[model samples]
Target: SMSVKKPKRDDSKDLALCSMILTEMETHEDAWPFLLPVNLKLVPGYKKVIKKPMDFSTIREKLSSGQYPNLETFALDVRLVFDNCETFNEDDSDIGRAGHNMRKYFEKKWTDTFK
Candidate 1:
């Protein structure tokens, strides 16, 4: 006889973890540039280059609003913040370096928490 098995997923822990991660990122020194959305008036080509801009504040709002159905979905926007930074600033630039630092920190926390 063959039986089918179904897996059940819980998102509560994921939501809590995301909130914790957001707080940690907000306090991080390298999070300055990513704390808020980039000012389009200040950055000439930012609007054009970074089509889907993401920031810590935006992520927090989304997470609080229950927009992310899973942890992976939440992670997507978090990574986007760093991706946009690298795309807009040169790797050697201060902001660019900060993005790299923030990305590394976030990835570490993610792995340690879930992996």
Candidate 2:
């Protein structure tokens, strides 16, 4: 039987993994974007804790009004690990369209529930 080869882990590769996960989380429009940023801010030096999955609180107070952090900042932070960060630029049209659809779905759901 042949054994499957495992790829070596490197800093740049790790960073790319981190970036892709973060982007997916951000584009999950069903959940509030505010939550992710708030949870990340609670930690010291956001970069330090980003390597793993995060657990965020659902307390109403934690979810209260605040300015949501921009996605660009998170993207830039992930890019730093790579010598050619520009190559990871995420401009997939499909993802962009999905994000738009998600927003519309939430908006319609909210309006229907409230009215």
RMSD of each: 2.4, 18.4
**Which 10 successive residues of model 2 have the least lDDT summed?**
80-89
In candidate 1, what are the lDDT values of residues 1-115, reduced to their tens digit? 2686666665558788879988999999888999999998998999998999999999999999979888999889999999898888999999989999999999999999888
Query: What stretches of model 1 exceed 4 Å from their correct place?
Result: 1-3, 6-10
Task: Evaluate residue 97 in candidate 2 and report its C-alpha lDDT on the 0 to 100 scale.
Answer: 45
Once fitted onto the true fold, the runs of candidate 2 whose alpha carbons sit more than 4 angstroms away are 1-61, 64-92
What's the lDDT for all of these models?
A: 0.90, 0.37
Give residue 70's lDDT in candidate 1 (0 to 100): 85
> What's the CA error at residue 105 for candidate 2, in Å?
1.0
Candidate 1: lDDT over CA atoms? Answer: 0.90
Q: What is the lDDT of residue 68 in candidate 1?
A: 89
| Candidate 2 residue lDDT tens string, 48-69 | 5345332222222222322223
